[PDB]
């Protein structure tokens, strides 16, 4: 995430499962600019990116 790593949920069928928390201890803040584009991957072919 542009905020820390404990912000993107698990991409499962049905969720609200955020593993990073007070119980897991696996956190990683990184500095991201006010504008920036994450590199998403198309669930499908490649030219429809």
Ligand X SMILES: CCC1=C(C)/C(=C/C2=NC(=C\c3[nH]c(/C=C4\NC(=O)[C@H](C)[C@H]4CC)c(C)c3CCC(=O)O)/C(CCC(=O)O)=C2C)NC1=O
Interface ranges with ligand X (CB under 6 A): 12-15, 17, 39, 41-42, 46, 49
Q: Is 43 in the site for other proteins (CB under 8 A)?
A: no
What does 8 interact with, of ligand X, other proteins, none (CB < 5 to 8 A by kind)? Answer: none
- Vertex 23: Cα angle to 20 and 26 (nearest 5): 40
CA distance 36 to 22: 28
CA distances from 20 to 7, 36, 47 (A): 8, 23, 33
The footprint of other proteins (CB under 8 A) covers 2-4, 6-7, 10-13, 17-24, 26-27, 29-39, 41, 45-47, 49
């Amino acid at each position: 995430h542009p905020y820390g790593r404990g912000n993107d949920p698990l991409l499962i069928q049905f969720g609200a499962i955020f593993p990073i928390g007070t119980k897991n201890l696996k956190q990683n803040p990184a500095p991201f600019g006010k504008d920036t584009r994450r590199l998403l991957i198309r669930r499908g072919p490649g030219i429809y990116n």
